[PDB]
């Protein structure tokens, strides 16, 4: 019999998600119940997996395909049949997949590098210009950087986040829509007139996001600057299989999708990485020494970023402990037996609980809570399906190399140009908005006074 956490009569397990930190709650449940537990709500069931033993079966694409979790079905209200919220079998998924993969080729990535540097230099200059005793609001500045990077690299659009003391309106609306989706999970009678205003606000925030997408497309339309970026591929690329391009409706959904997926989780990653660095000073020193050794020019080169091996290890270890898109959903393609123990029928759902997978002591050893970048000295040594911060198979993250190149560049420059102080002895507090991010994480920087 499958373990199951505590129930609330007719509501079954649903009230367990009536919390501001649902993923962290599910992790605690996994600690108590083990590698698999059933989670029921009125009218639905899923099974949360936490061991590599079971997740390696879940990642077999002949047996399971990507499912849209409840969260993703609600995000689909604004993300449509964009890549993240489309089913594998929808024509627009494989079309967009084939059309946009070229936007993340090696040659594309080399092409984005200069614009990544543009935004990174803005970050470095902001911090150089701070006065004595001033501090840095880490997740806020990381969100400024990542949003601006996807906007510029992807769409030749400048959000100019470093010119604002508040979040860009896009961010404010995105955040409000995302945690409104985190709210809709735990609810009942959605057509209740009580939520007429919540729907009005949801539609308002969606309109804000779509108005900006309108601007991006119109600006490209009127331009004559010869762009060869993500939007270029959206507007002109043809799917080799069907021979078709994307239509205008799908393009709008892809823009929204990439603006959100293309920064939020990267800002979390950078925030967690800097957190672990300041909490582990020997690791910080080792990373700083690499940055100084490798980044010998005022502008980092593409090749130099690729040579930041230890900074890459730091980022992977941060993703191990706190993968910022912490779960993904699967359904059974056919009847099948999971783990030689659990019979599933076609259509049965699974949730992969990534932070728990990443704490599987049979894979990582007993010290799973310790921050040790050296675990990733040779990424080849990690068993298959043991480390899954970017999902699985053909439905894995399309932007993984983009995110990692950006984060490595930025963290490298940060470690080259400043020493960091955990001046408040910050107590980790992880805010959940579907994605994960340190809340209230602040540091002080002291410039090493190296020119740009």
Report how far residue 22's alpha carbon sits from residue 182's, in angstroms, rounded to the nearest whole number: 9
Other Cβ atoms closer than 10 A to 400: 13
To the query of whether residue 397 is one of the catalytic residues in this protein, the response is yes
Active site residue 143: no
CB of 399 to ligand HEM, least distance (A): 2
Q: Tell whether residue 208 is a contact of a second copy (CB under 8 A).
A: no
Q: Is residue 160 near a second copy by the rule CB under 8 A?
A: yes
Cα 335 to Cα 62, 170, 416: the distances in Å are 12, 43, 54
SS3 state at 43:
coil
Q: Which residue has the tokens 């100084």?
A: 292
3-state secondary structure of 410: helix
48 is an annotated ligand-binding site residue: yes
232 near a second copy, judged by CB under 8 A: no
59 among annotated binding-site residues: no
d(CA 105, CA 293): 28
- 389 sits in which H/E element: none
- Among residues 33 and 121, whose Cβ is nearest to a second copy? 121
Which of the ranges 91-99, 256-264, 279-287, 293-301 carries the binding residues for ligand W1Z, by CB under 6 A?
A: 256-264
The binding site for ligand HEM (CB under 6 A) comprises 66, 83-84, 97, 150, 257-258, 261-262, 265-266, 269, 323-325, 328, 389-391, 395, 397-399, 402-403
Cβ–Cβ under 8 Å, residues 58 and 64: yes
CA-based end-to-end distance of the chain? 62
**In a 3-state reduction of DSSP, which class is residue 63?**
coil
Query: Which residue, 15 or 111, has its beta carbon nearer to ligand W1Z?
Result: 15
390 classed as catalytic: yes
Residue 44's nearest CA partner among 67, 65, 25 is: 67
Contact of residue 79 among ligand HEM, a second copy, ligand W1Z, none (CB under 5-8 Å per partner type): ligand W1Z
Say whether residue 140 binds ligand W1Z (CB under 6 A): no
Q: Which secondary structure element, helix H or strand E, spans residue 112, and what is its range?
A: helix 106-128
Q: Are 155 and 213 in contact (CB under 8 A)?
A: no
| The only residue of 7, 105, 203, 223 in contact with a second copy, by rule CB under 8 A | 223
Q: How far apart are CA 238 and CA 243, in angstroms?
A: 6
Pick one of 43, 129, 188, 343: the residue that binds a second copy (CB under 8 A). 129
Is residue 280 left, alpha or beta, with left meaning phi > 0 and alpha meaning psi from -120 to 50? beta
Which residue from 11, 121, 185, 450 is in contact with ligand W1Z, where contact means CB under 6 A?
185
Q: One of 85, 143, 257, 265 is an active-site residue; which one?
A: 265
Binding string, 89-118, against ligand W1Z, x = CB under 6 A? ------------------------------
Q: C-alpha distances in angstroms, 81 versus 168, 202, 254, 341?
A: 25, 19, 8, 36
> Of the candidates 41, 294, 319, 411, which one interacts with ligand W1Z according to CB under 6 A?
41
Least distance from a second copy to the Cβ atom of residue 214, Å: 12
Q: Which residues are catalytic?
A: 265, 390, 397
Question: What does the binding site for ligand W1Z look like in residue numbers (CB under 6 A)?
Answer: 14, 17, 22-23, 39, 41, 44, 46, 69-72, 75, 79, 84-85, 185, 257, 260-261, 264-265, 325-328, 351, 434-435
- Residues of each annotated binding site for (9Z)-hexadecenoate: 48
- Residues of each annotated binding site: 48, 397
Question: What does the binding site for a second copy look like in residue numbers (CB under 8 A)?
Answer: 126, 129-133, 157-158, 160, 162-166, 215, 218-219, 222-223
């Amino acid at each position: 019999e499958m373990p199951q956490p505590k129930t609330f009569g007719e509501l079954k397990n649903l009230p367990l998600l009536n919390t501001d930190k649902p993923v962290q709650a599910l992790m605690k449940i996994a600690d108590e119940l083990g590698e698999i537990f059933k989670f029921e709500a009125p009218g639905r069931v899923t099974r949360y997996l936490s061991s590599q033993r079971l997740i390696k079966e879940a990642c077999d694409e002949s047996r399971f395909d990507k499912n849209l979790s409840q969260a993703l079905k609600f995000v689909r209200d604004f993300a449509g049949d964009g890549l993240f919220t489309s089913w594998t079998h929808e024509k627009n998924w494989k079309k967009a997949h084939n059309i946009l993969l070229p936007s993340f080729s090696q040659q594309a990535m080399k092409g984005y590098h200069a614009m990544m540097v543009d935004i990174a230099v803005q970050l470095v200059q902001k911090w150089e210009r701070l006065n004595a005793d001033e501090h840095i609001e880490v997740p806020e500045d990381m969100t400024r950087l990542t949003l601006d990077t996807i906007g510029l690299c992807g769409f030749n659009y400048r959000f100019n986040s470093f010119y604002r003391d508040q979040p860009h309106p896009f961010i404010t609306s995105m955040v409000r829509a995302l945690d409104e989706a985190m709210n809709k999970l735990q609810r009942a009678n959605p057509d209740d007139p009580a939520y007429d205003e919540n729907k009005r606000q949801f539609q308002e925030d969606i309109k804000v996001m779509n108005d900006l997408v309108d601007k991006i497309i119109a600006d490209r339309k009127a331009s004559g600057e010869q762009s060869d970026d993500l939007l270029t591929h959206m507007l002109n690329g043809k799917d080799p299989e069907t021979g078709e391009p994307l239509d205008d409706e799908n393009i709008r959904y892809q823009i929204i999708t990439f603006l959100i997926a293309g920064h939020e989780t990267t800002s979390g990653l950078l925030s967690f990485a800097l957190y672990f660095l300041v909490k582990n000073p020997h690791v910080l020193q080792k990373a700083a020494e690499e940055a100084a050794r490798v980044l010998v020019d005022p502008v980092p080169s593409y090749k130099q970023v690729k040579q930041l091996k230890y900074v890459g290890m730091v980022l992977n270890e941060a993703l191990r402990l706190w993968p910022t898109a912490p779960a993904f959903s699967l359904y059974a393609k056919e009847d099948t037996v999971l783990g030689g123990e659990y019979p599933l029928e076609k259509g049965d759902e699974l949730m992969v609980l990534i932070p728990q997978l990443h704490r599987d002591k049979t894979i990582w050893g007993d010290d799973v809570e310790e921050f040790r970048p050296e675990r990733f000295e040779n990424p080849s040594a990690i068993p298959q399906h043991a480390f899954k911060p970017f999902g699985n198979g053909q439905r894995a993250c399309i932007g993984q190399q983009f995110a990692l190149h950006e984060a490595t560049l930025v963290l490298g420059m940060m470690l080259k140009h400043f020493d960091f102080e955990d001046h408040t002895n910050y107590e980790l507090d992880i805010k959940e908005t579907l994605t994960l991010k340190p809340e209230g994480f602040v540091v002080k920087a002291k410039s090493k006074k190296i020119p740009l």
